[PDB]
Design a binder for these strands. Structure first.
Ligand code: NA
Ligand code: NA
Ligand code: NA
Ligand code: NA
Length: 327
DNA sequence: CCGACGGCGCATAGC
DNA sequence: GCTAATGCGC
DNA sequence: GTCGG
C-alpha cells in the first residue's frame, strides 16, 4: 500500500523503535515497535482510529493510544520532546555509524562527542570497525541497484573460481530473490574439502584474491569462517566513482551449505513459515541442519542435504524458487 | 502475572 | 599472559 | 510493548 495510507503512523513507530534501541537499550521494545510498523505498513486501509489498529497482531493498547494521539493532533508529544533532546537525538544519531552501538554512542555523547565532525576530531577514541564506518558513513546508507549487484557478483564468482574451481559460492539475500536493490552483499562459500567432521585458509585465500584485484578495500572483521568488509566496483577513464559497499562472506561446511543458502535467502517471513510447516511434519529446521523429531520431541541426527530441493522434499513441500519466497 | 522476544562469529575487563 | 563476558552486527 | 501460557 502507498505510504499515503499510514506513513505518518509507520514513520512515528519506526522513530520510537530507534529511540528504544539506541537510547533506552530496550531491544524488545525496538522489535515491538517494528513489528507494529510492519503489520500496519501491510494494512490496505488508511487507519481511522487506534482501536482499528489494535485488531492487528503486534499492535497493543499503548500503540493504539499513540495512534489516537497522532490521528487527532498530527504529532506525538513524547516523540517531539525526545526529538529536540540534544543528548538523546545525538546518541540515536551516532549509532548510524557502523561499529557504534548504543553503548559506544552513550559513552561518546557523555564526553561531548555528538556529531560526525566530533568523531573525525577524535579518531584516537575509535576502534578499527568504527573508523571504517565513519569513513564510509554516507556510502553505507545508500542502496545498491541490482545492476551493480550483478557486476559485484560477476567479480566475486570469477575470483572465487580462479582461486579454486571447486569452491561453490552463492550470493544470497533479497538479491537472490530478485530484488531491484540491495543493502549489502551476502556471499555463502563452501568447498568439498570442508565438512562438519573434517582448511583454516579456505576463507582467507578467497578474501586475499578479492583484495589483490582491489575489489575488497577494507576489513571490518575476519576469522576462519566469517569475513565482514567493504568493497567497491571499479570505475573507468573519467566516470565518477561507485560508492563503497558492505560485503560479508561466510564459509559453511558443505553438508550444511544448502541449509545456509536457504536460510540466508529468506525472506524472514518465508523462513518462519517454512519452519512452521517443517515442525507440523516432524522436522526441525535451523540455519545449519534439518533433523527429524521423535514422538517424545527428541531431535535425531541431521539428515543429508545436497540442494535446497532436498529440504523441501523432506517436509513434503513443492520446491519454490527464490523469487516466490517473499512469504 | 510474568517470561519470551534469535543465536552466534569476531573484536576488544577480570584474573 | 589466558579466559570469559560484552558490544556489535547480522 | 505485545503476546500468550
Ligand atoms: Na493487537
Ligand atoms: Na551502528
Ligand atoms: Na545502526
Ligand atoms: Na581446478
Amino acid at each position: 500500500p502507498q505510504e499515503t495510507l499510514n506513513g505518518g503512523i509507520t514513520d512515528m513507530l519506526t522513530e520510537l523503535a530507534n529511540f528504544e534501541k539506541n537510547v533506552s537499550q530496550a531491544i524488545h521494545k525496538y522489535n515491538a515497535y517494528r513489528k507494529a510498523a510492519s503489520v500496519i505498513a501491510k494494512y490496505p486501509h488508511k487507519i481511522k482510529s487506534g482501536a482499528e489498529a489494535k485488531k492487528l497482531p503486534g499492535v497493543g493498547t499503548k500503540i493504539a493510544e499513540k495512534i489516537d494521539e497522532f490521528l487527532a493532533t498530527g504529532k506525538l508529544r513524547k516523540l517531539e520532546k525526545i526529538r529536540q533532546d540534544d543528548t538523546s537525538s545525538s546518541i540515536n544519531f551516532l549509532t548510524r555509524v557502523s561499529g557504534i552501538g548504543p553503548s559506544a554512542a552513550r559513552k561518546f555523547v557523555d564526553e561531548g562527542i555528538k556529531t560526525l565532525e566530533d568523531l573525525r576530531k577524535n579518531e584516537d577514541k575509535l576502534n578499527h570497525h568504527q573508523r571504517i564506518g565513519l569513513k564510509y558513513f554516507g556510502d553505507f546508507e545508500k542502496r545498491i541497484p541490482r545492476e551493480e549487484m550483478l557486476q559485484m557478483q560477476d567479480i566475486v564468482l570469477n575470483e572465487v573460481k580462479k582461486v579454486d574451481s571447486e569452491y561453490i559460492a552463492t550470493v544470497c539475500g533479497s538479491f537472490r530473490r530478485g530484488a531491484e536493490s540491495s543493502g549489502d552483499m551476502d556471499v555463502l562459500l563452501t568447498h568439498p574439502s570442508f565438512t562438519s567432521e573434517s582448511q583454516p585458509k579456505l576463507l582467507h585465500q578467497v578474501v586475499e584474491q578479492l583484495q589483490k584485484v582491489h575489489f575488497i578495500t577494507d576489513t571490518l572483521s575476519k576469522g576462519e569462517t566469517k569475513f565482514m568488509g567493504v568493497c567497491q566496483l571499479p570505475s573507468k577513464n573519467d566516470e565518477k566513482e561507485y560508492p563503497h559497499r558492505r560485503i560479508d562472506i561466510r564459509l559453511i561446511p558443505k553438508d550444511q551449505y544448502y541449509c545456509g543458502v536457504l536460510y540466508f535467502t529468506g525472506s524472514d517471513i518465508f523462513n518462519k513459515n517454512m519452519r512452521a510447516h517443517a515442525l507440523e511434519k516432524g522436522f526441525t529446521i535451523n540455519e545449519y541442519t534439518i533433523r527429524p523429531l521423535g514422538v517424545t520431541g527428541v531431535a535425531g541426527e541431521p539428515l543429508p542435504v545436497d540442494s535446497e530441493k532436498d529440504i523441501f522434499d523432506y517436509i513434503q513441500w513443492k520446491y519454490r524458487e527464490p523469487k516466490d519466497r517473499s512469504e
